[PDB]
Design an enzyme around this catalytic site. Sequence first.
Site, short mmCIF file in Angstrom:
data_model
loop_
_atom_site.label_atom_id
_atom_site.label_comp_id
_atom_site.label_asym_id
_atom_site.label_seq_id
_atom_site.Cartn_x
_atom_site.Cartn_y
_atom_site.Cartn_z
N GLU A 130 -7.40 -0.72 -1.46
CA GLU A 130 -7.91 -1.89 -0.73
C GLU A 130 -9.31 -1.48 -0.27
OE1 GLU A 130 -6.50 -2.37 3.40
OE2 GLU A 130 -5.33 -4.04 2.57
N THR A 151 0.81 -1.22 0.00
CA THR A 151 0.00 0.00 0.00
C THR A 151 0.84 1.26 0.00
OG1 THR A 151 -1.85 -1.16 0.99
CG2 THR A 151 -1.81 1.24 1.25
N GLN A 155 -14.47 -15.37 2.33
CA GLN A 155 -13.71 -15.16 1.10
C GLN A 155 -14.58 -14.62 -0.02
OE1 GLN A 155 -10.31 -14.96 2.54
NE2 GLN A 155 -10.41 -14.93 0.30
C1 LIG Z 1 -7.15 -10.24 -0.01
C2 LIG Z 1 -7.24 -10.95 1.29
C3 LIG Z 1 -6.53 -10.61 2.40
C4 LIG Z 1 -5.56 -9.46 2.45
C5 LIG Z 1 -6.08 -8.15 3.11
C6 LIG Z 1 -5.17 -7.69 4.26
O1 LIG Z 1 -4.18 -6.90 3.60
N1 LIG Z 1 -6.69 -11.34 3.59
C7 LIG Z 1 -7.57 -12.44 3.69
O2 LIG Z 1 -7.66 -13.05 4.75
N2 LIG Z 1 -8.31 -12.81 2.55
C8 LIG Z 1 -8.18 -12.09 1.32
O3 LIG Z 1 -8.85 -12.54 0.40
#
Ligand SMILES: Cc1c(CCCO)[nH]c(=O)[nH]c1=O
EC number: 2.7.1.21
Lengths: 305, 310, 305, 310
Positions: D38, D18, D80
């Site tokens: 994000e 980031t 997810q």
């Molecule tokens: C993209 C993602 C992250 C990354 C976000 C934190 O930077 N963490 C998870 O547990 N599942 C996901 O799908």
Amino acid sequence: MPTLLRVYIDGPHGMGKTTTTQLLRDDIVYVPEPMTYWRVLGASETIANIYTTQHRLDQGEISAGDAAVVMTSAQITMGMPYAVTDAVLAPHIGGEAGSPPALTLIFDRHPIAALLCYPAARYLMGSMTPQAVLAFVALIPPTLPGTNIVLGALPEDRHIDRLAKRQRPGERLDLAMLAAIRRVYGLLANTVRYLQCGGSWREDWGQLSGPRPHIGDTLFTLFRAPELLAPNGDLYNVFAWALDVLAKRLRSMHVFILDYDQSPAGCRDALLQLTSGMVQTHVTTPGSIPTICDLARTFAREMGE
Amino acid sequence: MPTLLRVYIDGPHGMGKTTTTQLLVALGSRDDIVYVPEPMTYWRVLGASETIANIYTTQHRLDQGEISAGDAAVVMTSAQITMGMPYAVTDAVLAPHIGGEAGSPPALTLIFDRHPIAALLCYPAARYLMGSMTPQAVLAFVALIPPTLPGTNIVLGALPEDRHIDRLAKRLDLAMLAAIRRVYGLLANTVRYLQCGGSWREDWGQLSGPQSNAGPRPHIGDTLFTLFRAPELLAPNGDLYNVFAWALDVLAKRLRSMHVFILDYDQSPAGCRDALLQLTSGMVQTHVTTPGSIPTICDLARTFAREMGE
Amino acid sequence: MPTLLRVYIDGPHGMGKTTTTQLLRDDIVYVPEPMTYWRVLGASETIANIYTTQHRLDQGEISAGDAAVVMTSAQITMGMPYAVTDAVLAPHIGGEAGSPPALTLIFDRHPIAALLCYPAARYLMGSMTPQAVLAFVALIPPTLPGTNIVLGALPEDRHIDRLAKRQRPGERLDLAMLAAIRRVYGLLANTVRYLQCGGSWREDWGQLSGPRPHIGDTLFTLFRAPELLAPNGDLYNVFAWALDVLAKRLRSMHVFILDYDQSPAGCRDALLQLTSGMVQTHVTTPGSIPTICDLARTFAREMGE
Amino acid sequence: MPTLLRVYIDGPHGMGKTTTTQLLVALGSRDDIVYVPEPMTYWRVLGASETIANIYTTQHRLDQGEISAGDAAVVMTSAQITMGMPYAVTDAVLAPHIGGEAGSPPALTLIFDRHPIAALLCYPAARYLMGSMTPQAVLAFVALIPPTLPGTNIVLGALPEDRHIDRLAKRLDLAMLAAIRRVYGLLANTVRYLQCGGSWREDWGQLSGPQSNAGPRPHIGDTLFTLFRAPELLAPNGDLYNVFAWALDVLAKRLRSMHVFILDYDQSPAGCRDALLQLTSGMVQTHVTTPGSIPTICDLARTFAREMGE
Ligand SMILES: Cc1c(CCCO)[nH]c(=O)[nH]c1=O
Ligand SMILES: Cc1c(CCCO)[nH]c(=O)[nH]c1=O
Ligand SMILES: Cc1c(CCCO)[nH]c(=O)[nH]c1=O
Ligand SMILES: Cc1c(CCCO)[nH]c(=O)[nH]c1=O
């Protein structure tokens, strides 16, 4: 308000619509072919005049201009019954009901047969100017809700066979006309689909000189005729506006394909199974049903023999 | 929503309609009044070759007995389709932009050189009287007249026949002039009759042997319904075939919601203009369907004018 | 290049699709219900888990949040076979052919059943959040040319009758679910039509709080859910974009209604008469047909029992 | 047609992705580089309540033996879906605007905070290794990965585990950190393997017991294909069920046309930025489908950023 189901059986003639509609007391009415208007009421033997005019054009007895005049004048007579029927029926049609119906109105053809399809086919036979065709298109009545049109499917050899044994008064078995009419209706089905899938004729116009049908497989290809274009190749606005109307009129139509390559009983069932996906509407008054029935029965009695 | 004023200047040719209209357009701001002119270019080149000349040649030929009634009718019917094309297409693309009626300034004023009924009813009816068109074809055109949109203001013209003959004569078919003058007089009486509650079906039997928005109810014999009592349209029992009767129902429906005004053309061009300008005050305006309808309408009219009005 | 006809038999379960497809050697292949994947391969008795979870939610044994988790997870398992099938088949699909076909591929359901319709119905049963539903929608595969989907028509009492005698392993006869699923599919058919007739959800959105179906009779009404709106009542852009995808995915689909209120032989003919208006496509390679056949036959052998 | 450069910064969390991205965006003109951040707000409020916290709480609960594997899997799978939503919807609306590849300045540069595969493949695969997700569900997500559009440039990050642990630790689940680091290492090897002509079906039997755009072809055992040799996916004859084998075919297809680059995060924020800026030079650009695609894309990114990135 009662519900109504309008079904327009159209497509190229000679496949069996008549028979199919025929094999079929108050819940269903049939508006038949207005043969008496064509042969007597509107003018004298209109079909005969039409086929005799093409034949003479083919033989070189008359010019293309002579034929187009005759042909244009004749199409006004042919569509009359459809146009007058649509005009008095319009006010009674309300909005769609949704996914039985108080009344089922089965028609023998829709106004576009006489205002679009036949004229377009005659344009393809060199007996009608493209300007006249777009003039008939400009006059196509607004597409009301629940406009279900059944078009037929039938292999050409079978069609010729069927057409040969069911010729109309004054008709001449013309294979070039059969091909032209079959081509127009095939393009018609593709056009509805093209429009329903977001097709924009103005955006795809350039493709005619370079998930939906390609514009070249729609009715828009017919209007690339040189008579309609300016010296720089641009479509004149008058005609472009006529194509805008075509798009608007066709788009909201619901097309259903009926396989005519089967026995009359098969076609009859086929057609009846096809009604489950058709769109029904509400009528505008409580006394609309009765009026519709009389209109239809009066039409049949006076013009369908 | 912005309001719109649509005015169709119509009536027999040769009265000064075009001049009057252009004078009216010349008074208003550049963009608050647009003109949809006579589509002469479509009639002379685009739709077909020289249409007016063909219409007049056909009639003359018929009069001389050089062609039959059938030959003339086929040519007149086809010529009338071409003549009406631009009016029909313009009405079809304008339709969706017209909203409900508002009341008797507005965002935009559209002045039209004629209305679809001129080519779908009036000229065809005049040709029927001239023997160059069948009544069945006339009724076929009637059945094709597009739905009358709200705020349909039609201005018809009045002018003494001797003055009209003078103004028109620089062929000069006087029989056609008389027929078109009679048809337009019948038209105005028809609207009036319909607006006073007249029912053609109820008065049909009164047949045998103008003011559009004022006066008492005219007799059915002084309306357009009288032209359709022809033997071709009558069944063996004496009455009209239902096909034709339904066409008359369409005619009533189409003309009853229109707003007709009579403009006296027996005065100077400027007089006509000011007379017309005063008439607009009692005309019905409508709202537009979208906020961008005004611009679209202006472009449509300008495009039409550029391509077809010269 | 050979032509292909894909037919996706979908609609609410319990009307007879299975029977209808069943009554019907190289020109037609059938991709059946992947029951073995649902009961064993992907997870253990997935249908059973689904109905048991709703039942417990109804009884108040678990919360709405608990149910939604279960329900969302379960739908991933249910759609798997459809999603994997679509993904490997995609590359072989060419453009439309136009108005017989080398191969006819009849499928038992389309990916939208598991990614849109069932989830939407579960949202209506309070066992799935609307955000999850739009997340499944966002994952709907691009609509390829020739996507013909058959939806069924059947009066509710008849449907209940039929559903009662053909329950699946672990299924519970739930009349509330039957109504929800029937409502979603009815809205689905209306939505396609709405979109095909030029409907714009963003333009008609205001009508939900005030010739095509009214937006209130389409799937867009379901997404007026409060979870998806900001404090001022506006739809969050994330979800508005998901609705844009829904519109794009649904619009180019060709819907066909099959009346299931008749005998199995009737349905069979009915369905077969319906294929004449279906859209066919070309394949991308000369060896696409064979590959498609093996895929389908392998699918059937491994997952359809 | 104007050209477009799409860069997806991805890889394990806690490396400085980031920060690096924002520094890069800060260098370019106001409107020639846009950032798609994000979507934390969607994850914390809009899609569901606090998603990340729920993911970590579930794993901890599982580790402690307070919930079963099945309970954890159902929560992880559903979480997810929510996590990937914004990436999937953005890809779906952007798709139609992407044209063919051009070559290695451009009209617009779009920097994304992660790619759909992060939520549809990488995290799910890491959770499978953590025992909180089934391999069948992971493959279900794989089968749902949207078609890989042309010019898909993905930047993955490299960083020593001791430095990563340090940077990440201000829970601190080290097992998950190891699993996500391994998954991303496998991912880079998978692309490389696929681009060198590797066929998983041909090498499947070699299974038993990083550089993305450079080096020799990796062994299948060092790619993502090794994770799917689980007993749940194997039929009684030892081979993979066809359902799962087809999911691996989708995985190959989706990753083979991507352009992956490794960015070394073991340096200062400015170093990372300049390192990233240098990497963009060998990245593939694409044309846009319409002339008004650029503006639309900017608005989409700005809208996304405003609503979901804080
Ligand atoms: C993209 C993602 C992250 C990354 C976000 C934190 O930077 N963490 C998870 O547990 N599942 C996901 O799908
Ligand atoms: C409908 C129609 C037909 C078909 C009538 C069925 O035989 N034939 C024509 O020449 N013009 C028309 O418009
Ligand atoms: C409008 C019209 C005119 C008027 C145009 C001349 O001003 N003349 C005809 O013969 N037919 C028509 O239809
Ligand atoms: C397709 C489907 C069904 C129908 C399967 C036929 O019995 N049921 C569900 O609960 N979810 C699904 O997605």
